[PDB]
Design a protein around this motif. Structure first.
Motif: not given
Ligand code: MG
Ligand code: MG
Ligand code: MG
Ligand code: MG
Ligand code: MG
Lengths: 138, 201, 190, 175, 109
Positions: A30-32, A34, A51, D74, D97, D144, D153, D156
RNA sequence: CCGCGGCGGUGCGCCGCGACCGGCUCCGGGACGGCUGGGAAGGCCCGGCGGGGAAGGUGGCUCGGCCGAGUGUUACAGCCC
RNA sequence: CAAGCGUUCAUAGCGACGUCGCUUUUUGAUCCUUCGAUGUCGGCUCUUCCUAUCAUUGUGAAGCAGAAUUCACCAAGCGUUG
RNA sequence: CGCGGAGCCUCGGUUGGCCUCGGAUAGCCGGUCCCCCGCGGGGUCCGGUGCGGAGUGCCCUUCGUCCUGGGAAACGGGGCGCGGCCGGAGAGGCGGCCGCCCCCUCGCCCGUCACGCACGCCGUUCGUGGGGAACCUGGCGCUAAACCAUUCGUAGACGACC
């Protein structure tokens, strides 16, 4: 260099939160922070999930990017995660933590004993290996 | 936890650590912070130098030997920051500081003890990777240490030594693992009972 | 706004062999070997091209100001490659009205020795950095040649003598004397 | 107005009938708030600007949630906005979004806070509307937006920095 | 032959900032850093235990040098797994940052 | 005196227990109403009607062992939406 | 901000009509403290601090060729006399 | 120094953990067949681990006593058991490693019996030969300086100092 490429379809184990300790296919991002997330066979509804509360696995699978439950029901079901997970090193050191907390005072008395004699039968061999390592040095 | 604490200052954040130290000093736990040169601070090098030099100008005009003591060694600097987070006017606060103990480099007894790390004061965690900084070592130098060079050469001497131990300890574990395999059918129904209630898997 | 990705491939020639220790790139070609650390900038340096054809720098969860730096690493790497294949040559031509600037190199590169700039008795001395071979030219009159593998090192060293040679308490509109860089190039051109 | 996580407390209300006009019109506003009691209050702020209508002279007929028709899917929420800066009062297109109109503005209200120090009591939503793929302007959103979309990620952090408040092991952050 | 008396520190007595209220002490039990965690420690007996100078009687014993203020854990104290305990006599402040000994023997398992 | 039988007062000193009740602070369960007679979802399928990303595709280019991998485009569905 | 001067050219140096500030080494207001009265002007000596830099160190300016000079920066290190 | 007998008091505690370096858009370990250096170190290759299992979420060691009469385990432990050689100095204070005497046979399963079973009750258990302050045994060593007074001034109020 990374090796875990948050795709459409990284299986992610949910570190924590309402659904802790369950696997989850990241359906779509969805997003940065989520994802749109779903764990059909691990019992987790299609919902949004951040995340930060999820860690991710070497496993991928191949629904496409807004597939609708039935199609992530499959691709999980064959490929077969819930058996391949459980042959992993995750699953076996989870389901070990589990088994220590889940341990009666009896069990713990046994281990106390079982350890002790293990740790002697292991020790006497180490002593004997240094004897052989010293006689090799001679 | 119980007993004496040993914290390895490297990679920590000067005050973020000191708040955690100072809480446990007040709960009767004996803390020993070590290696305070390594301790590091957010903000860029100079910023905090400039901020220290500001300290040094603060000084009791009519006589300075009374006035604030701007100690220069990192041990001492940190102590100060811990001390400002104790109620040190009072008896429990001075009794607290006595439970603290702080070194530059890592000495006798404390070379020879395993030693811990406060992640919640740890720089890699608390800071963003695109931000600047001082080591209290270099700060301490440019403010009037005499002993950055010495505590370098001694720690290099200690590191070389500690490496020997690490390597000999490494060699015992290789014996443990080879001796498990060289005796795994008269401990093969004990190791069973280990792995069943979690232990050793 | 954070940009999901930015990246860039450097095209590495057949001569050279870069080999990156994590983040630290080392480069060996004909001329020598160079090294440099990008243990600050924080990116992902992959060596994707097999045989050995591509350095690719990623950047990844980056906002505007780190996205900048993708290209800067990418540069200090090309700039190394040119250095270890070709090697650089900055030329610097001395300039004057009157007192002849009187240069004399004095170990190998190393000491660049300057009598008489503007009638001054004090003989300016300048060290080069390691790996920087200065030398007085030929085929031209008042002209040095600073050879080296490393741009960084070769151009402090230009600048050190270019800046050692500065006039004070004058019109530097008028007093246009000193030594200064005329031509940044390479040893071998290809 | 404050916040929590917003909800679509949709509302219709007539200007109550006089002897002269017996069947005055009704009007759904997509009032867009944290509960009923305010989302009631918020049409009347809003209607009293537009019509010549008031809490005495009116009635809410229907107030009730409109609750998402597509909340597993979404979506590209745009929003003809209006606010009040310290200087003047300013219109905006903005894109979030999220997957749910309300949660989409829940964002917006939190950004107008941050990107502008605008509080809710200053903001006005003209209208939200979900948008297709194309016809999105904001590059923040407009990424996105693909199929083979790809992350790690990277750096982290550990949280649980107090479970082991201390440890021997130093943490890790490559995973 | 070991703990039983499970390990805990006495941190302060319940207080505002320009006040303090000496009935209720604040007890920092070891290995308990959450308010979820702590529902075991409720109801349990505890003891600030000392020696002091003159001898005193000891049930199942000869007169010893040891004495105790003898109390009870009432309830939890804020998110972090602190606990509030009120002893029969008030605690003597000397004890701040010392042991007290929270038991098991009014267990409720 | 031995009863410590039954009644009325207590406790020398340290204590522990139990069950009612008041007030509290918590914790487990389980059943229902409503609602845009809730939105959403699932499964089973089926028979239809359309549109977008984009193919078990095709194609320009790349990288690897026809296959696997990367990018680029028309868009039918042999994916999905 | 900026109309001008400065041969020319706004702004090297300046800068009107306007306008926004500090500062408390000027005088006013004020009357908060003191009238069981805090020694009321200057000079000498002696410390220390500030910068609102006159010199000197290092600098950037000039309508700076030199010489000489003003504009400005870090700067209060040591100077400021008979 | 050793090893002996009473007693003021001042307290805190109530298994230990005997160790790398650091990185963090990376590490850990193995093994080298091969290569270089001083049993080691460095290199290269491959093989494993890496929400870490030669994991501080960690490891270890046990915790009512002894009987005796099986199996599993078998030279382990001890006598402040005793001498010599190490290594360790940052403010070491600790290890380590070698002879010889005597003594003991202990971890895990099991039989088999036992130990004041104090008759539901509290400071229980140890680091404890604590820290400190007073006194009863043997062997070996010990064997003052300081201040005053005096003198001197190198110094001065007196004090201080040479
Ligand atoms: Mg001049
Ligand atoms: Mg005791
Ligand atoms: Mg003019
Ligand atoms: Mg007076
Ligand atoms: Mg100034």
């Amino acid at each position: 260099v990374f090796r875990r490429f948050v795709e459409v379809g990284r299986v992610a184990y949910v570190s924590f939160g309402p659904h802790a300790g369950k696997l989850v296919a990241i359906v779509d991002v969805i997003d940065q922070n989520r994802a749109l997330v779903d764990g059909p066979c691990t019992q987790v509804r299609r919902q949004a999930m951040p995340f930060k509360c999820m860690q991710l696995t070497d496993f991928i699978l191949k629904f496409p990017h807004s597939a609708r439950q039935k199609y992530v029901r499959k691709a999980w079901e064959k490929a077969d995660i819930n058996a391949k997970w459980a042959a992993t090193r995750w699953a076996k050191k989870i389901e070990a933590r589990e088994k220590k907390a889940k341990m009666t005072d009896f069990d713990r008395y046994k281990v106390m004993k079982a350890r002790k004699m293990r740790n002697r039968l292991i020790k006497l061999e180490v002593k004997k290996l240094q004897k052989a390592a010293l006689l090799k040095a001679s | 936890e119980g007993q004496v604490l040993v914290l390895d200052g490297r990679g920590h954040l000067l005050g973020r650590l000191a708040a955690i130290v100072a809480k446990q000093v007040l709960l009767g736990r004996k803390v020993v912070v070590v290696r305070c040169e390594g301790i590091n601070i957010s903000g860029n090098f100079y910023r905090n130098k400039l901020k220290y030099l500001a300290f040094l100008r603060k000084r009791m005009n009519t006589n300075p030997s009374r006035g604030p003591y701007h100690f220069r060694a990192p041990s001492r600097i940190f102590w100060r920051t811990v001390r400002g987070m104790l109620p040190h006017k009072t008896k429990r606060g001075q009794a607290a500081l006595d439970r603290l103990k702080v070194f530059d480099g890592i000495p006798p007894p404390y070379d020879k003890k395993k030693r811990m790390v406060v992640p919640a004061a740890l720089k890699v965690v608390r800071l963003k990777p695109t931000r600047k900084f001082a080591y209290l070592g270099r700060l301490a130098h440019e403010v009037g240490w005499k002993y950055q060079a010495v505590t370098a050469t001694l720690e290099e001497k200690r590191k070389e030594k500690a490496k020997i131990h690490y390597r000999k300890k490494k060699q015992l574990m290789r014996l443990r693992k080879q001796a498990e395999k060289n005796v795994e059918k008269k401990i093969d129904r004990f190791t069973e009972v280990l792995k069943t209630h979690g232990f050793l898997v | 706004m954070k940009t999901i990705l930015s990246n860039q491939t450097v095209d590495i020639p057949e001569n050279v062999d870069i080999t990156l220790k994590g983040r630290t790139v080392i480069v060996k070609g004909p001329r020598g070997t160079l090294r440099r650390d990008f243990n600050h900038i924080n990116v992902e340096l992959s060596l994707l091209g097999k045989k050995k054809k591509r350095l690719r720098v990623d950047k990844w969860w980056g906002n505007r100001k780190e996205l900048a730096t993708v290209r800067t690493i990418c540069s200090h790497v090309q700039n190394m490659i040119k250095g270890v294949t070709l090697g650089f040559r900055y030329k610097m031509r001395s300039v004057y009205a009157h007192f002849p600037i009187n240069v004399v190199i004095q170990e190998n590169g190393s000491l660049v020795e300057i009598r008489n700039f503007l009638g001054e008795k004090y003989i300016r001395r300048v060290r080069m950095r390691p790996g920087v071979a200065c030398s007085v030219s030929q085929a031209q009159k008042d002209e040095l040649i600073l050879e080296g593998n490393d741009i960084e090192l070769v151009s402090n060293s230009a600048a050190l003598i270019q800046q050692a040679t500065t006039v004070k308490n004058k019109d530097i509109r008028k007093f246009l004397d000193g030594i200064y860089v005329s031509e940044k190039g390479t040893v071998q051109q290809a | 107005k404050a916040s929590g996580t917003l909800r679509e407390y949709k509302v219709v209300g007539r200007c109550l009938p006089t002897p002269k006009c017996r069947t005055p019109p009704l009007y759904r506003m997509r009032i867009f708030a944290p509960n009923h009691v305010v989302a009631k209050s918020r049409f009347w702020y809003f209607v009293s600007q537009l019509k010549k209508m008031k809490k005495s002279s009116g009635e809410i007929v229907y107030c009730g949630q409109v609750f998402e028709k597509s909340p597993l899917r979404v979506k590209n929420f745009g929003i003809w906005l209006r606010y009040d800066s310290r200087s003047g009062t300013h219109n905006m297109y903005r894109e979030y979004r999220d997957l749910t109109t309300a949660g989409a503005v829940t964002q917006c209200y939190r950004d107008m806070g941050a990107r502008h120090r605008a509080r809710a009591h200053s903001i006005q939503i003209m209208k939200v509307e979900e948008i297709a793929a194309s016809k999105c302007r904001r590059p923040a959103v407009k990424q996105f937006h693909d199929s083979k979309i790809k992350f790690p990620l990277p750096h982290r952090v550990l949280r649980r920095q107090h479970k082991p408040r201390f440890t021997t092991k130093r943490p890790n952050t490559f995973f | 032959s070991g703990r039983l008396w499970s390990k805990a520190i006495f941190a302060g007595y319940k207080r505002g900032l320009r006040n303090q209220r000496e009935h209720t002490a604040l007890l920092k039990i070891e290995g308990v850093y959450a308010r979820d965690e702590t529902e075991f420690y409720l109801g349990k007996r505890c003891a600030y235990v000392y020696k002091a100078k003159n001898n005193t009687v000891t049930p199942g014993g000869k007169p010893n040098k040891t004495r105790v203020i003898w109390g009870k854990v009432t309830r939890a104290h804020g998110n972090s797994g602190m606990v509030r305990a009120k002893f029969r006599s008030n605690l003597p402040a000397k004890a701040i940052g010392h042991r007290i000994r929270v038991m098991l023997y009014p267990s409720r398992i």
